[PDB]
Amino acid sequence: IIGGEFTTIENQPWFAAIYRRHRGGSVTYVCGGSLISPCWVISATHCFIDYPKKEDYIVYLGRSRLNSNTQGEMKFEVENLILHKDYSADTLAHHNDIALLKIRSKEGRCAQPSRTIQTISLPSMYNDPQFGTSCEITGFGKENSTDYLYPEQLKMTVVKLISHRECQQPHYYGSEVTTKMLCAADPQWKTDSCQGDSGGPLVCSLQGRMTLTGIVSWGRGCALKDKPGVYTRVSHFLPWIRSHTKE
Numbered sequence: 001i002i003g004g005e006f007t008t009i010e011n012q013p014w015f016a017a018i019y020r021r022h023r024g025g026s027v028t029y030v031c032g033g034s035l036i037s038p039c040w041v042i043s044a045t046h047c048f049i050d051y052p053k054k055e056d057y058i059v060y061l062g063r064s065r066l067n068s069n070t071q072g073e074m075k076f077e078v079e080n081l082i083l084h085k086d087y088s089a090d091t092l093a094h095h096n097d098i099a100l101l102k103i104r105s106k107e108g109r110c111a112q113p114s115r116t117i118q119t120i121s122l123p124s125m126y127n128d129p130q131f132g133t134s135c136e137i138t139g140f141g142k143e144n145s146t147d148y149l150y151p152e153q154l155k156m157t158v159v160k161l162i163s164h165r166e167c168q169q170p171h172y173y174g175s176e177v178t179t180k181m182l183c184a185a186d187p188q189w190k191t192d193s194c195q196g197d198s199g200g201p202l203v204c205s206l207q208g209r210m211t212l213t214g215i216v217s218w219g220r221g222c223a224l225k226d227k228p229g230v231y232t233r234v235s236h237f238l239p240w241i242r243s244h245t246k247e
């Protein structure tokens with residue numbers, strides 16, 4: 001997250017931190033995610049496409065820091081890693097960038113709700129916030145494009161939803177952005193998500209209810225003028241989500 005402010009997991013209880021176990025013994029951060037049900041986390045496919053082995057991932061809930069423990073945090077293994085079969089990456093656009101991770105603790109249980117661990121509501125069929133609406137994003141991603149390290153504390157910021165018409169303009173992204181994607185940015189181009197925030201949530205207050213509206217996916221650079229962040233439009237993937245989370 002470029003700009004914005006540091007926050008705690010108490011303010012983003014649905015946030016999931018995903019790490020990968022390494023061939024030696026070290027563990028590195030991969031992407032963010034969101035808890036949509038006690039046993040399910042939703043993230044982005046581009047985060048796992050190159051290493052589709054479920055056994056190498058670890059999911060933390062109730063965690064506020066990157067490399068240190070947080071009181072009340074819970075560790076989970078990945079029981080099933082579901083990637084979207086139609087995922088593809090073009091020059092800029094990442095299509096169908098969405099994934100599901102079924103989690104389970106060593107005792108074989110799912111997440112237990114608490115003050116620091118809660119689920120986030122999914123949207124209704126094709127029911128998205130009006131363009132110009134303020135939404136929030138959270139993540140452990142880069143604070144500056146020139147950084148090679150991630151911040152130790154979780155961050156969050158607020159951006160505004162941009163219409164498909166505006167985002168489709170020549171100086172923006174042209175035809176690369178589709179109706180299955182959502183653009184959001186700071187009107188001053190000062191704050192934005194960046195590398196490392198992938199898979200994280202774009203949450204919007206819809207009818208007094210916090211809703212998972214988008215998933216951090218792609219963008220040209222970070223916080224660049226006329227180059228908004230592009231998010232996977234969750235409302236267009238409800239059928240895919242329902243079919244893969246049943247049994």
Ligand SMILES: CCCCS(=O)(=O)N[C@H](CO)C(=O)N[C@@H](C)C(=O)NCc1ccc(C(=N)N)cc1
Pocket residue numbers: 046089090091092093094145192193194195196197198216217218219220221222223227228229230
């Ligand atoms: C430092 C990031 C540079 C990104 S880039 O090379 O200009 N664009 C590519 C185009 O497909 C890209 O976005 N790749 C994906 C995997 C990616 O890096 N996603 C993370 C990412 C998330 C948000 C944003 C943003 N809001 N601008 C920017 C990047």
